[PDB]
Ligand binder design. Sequence first.
Ligand SMILES: O=C(O)CNC(=O)C(=O)O
Ligand SMILES: [Mg+2]
Ligand code: NI
Ligand SMILES: [Zn+2]
Length: 331
Amino acid sequence: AQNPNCNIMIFHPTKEEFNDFDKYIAYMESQGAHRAGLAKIIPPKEWKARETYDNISEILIATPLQQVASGRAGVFTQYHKKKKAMTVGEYRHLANSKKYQTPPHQNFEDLERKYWKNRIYNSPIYGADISGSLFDENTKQWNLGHLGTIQDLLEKECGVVIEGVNTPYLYFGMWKTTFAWHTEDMDLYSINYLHLGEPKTWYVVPPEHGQRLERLARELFPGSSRGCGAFLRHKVALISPTVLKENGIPFNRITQEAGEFMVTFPYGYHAGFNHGFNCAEAINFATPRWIDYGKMASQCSCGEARVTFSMDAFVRILQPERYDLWKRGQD
Ligand SMILES: O=C(O)CNC(=O)C(=O)O
Ligand SMILES: [Mg+2]
Ligand code: NI
Ligand SMILES: [Zn+2]
């Protein structure tokens, strides 16, 4: 069995190997990458996402989210307070302001310490889930807006024909902006490219141990657990590495830098935070190996998780028994 300790693997594809996306995902899996839940892909030196970023301040963040925490430093939830629209230029200036900027620090480890110590005492503002792409249309390799769609994968594998589309999203982060512990919708893969700016630290639980994390989460958030049998779908709960280690939950950590891709694998729980102003792009995708995870994915039916249009068909086809209840939670 490859990668039995479920370590995060880092890949350095050549330009030739970067041509065929699906093939390279399958390659990484042949080496056991998926067992970690997360992999890093460093593009060949000859590749570029786009020529420059010199013109990104005009993008609009229609609904910036202030991430307000409740709990204790290592175990907290966050809610998103909607703020008034702002441009990327406005947001970048805010990120760099004394109130929100990254503190002095020695190295990534010191900064991680400061994050876990102090996150809860601040409410950073996140520009998340903005439909769009910053890849140049002429970038042919690993262009997140030119991937094969999840609908087409399900059609190819299963023969059914469904509505729905699959487009990328932009994320504009600042110091302490936080992504809570989650898997993807329908336990899909995700791919994330850090276009520019400061790093993003990731934590991940191996898919084969995801239920260990869920059990701890039920213990740590007992009211939330009573409200919903899949409340990590709400994407609001944080648990620190110290707490995970105290409770024997297997995990790994890695820091993604600008110019790097990360892939999350089906049912790989992940969480993390941004080091300072940055911009990432991400999208869900599927492979044949996903289909079995899609069929088994938990679902939130309490109404909190509310998701895209395109998830309807996935539930309807892969989880017909669950469809009626889940759709009530959508409606
Ligand atoms: O970048 C972020 O804030 C969150 N991204 C993801 O959870 C992902 O790419 O799957
Ligand atoms: Mg612009
Ligand atoms: Ni994710
Ligand atoms: Zn729920």
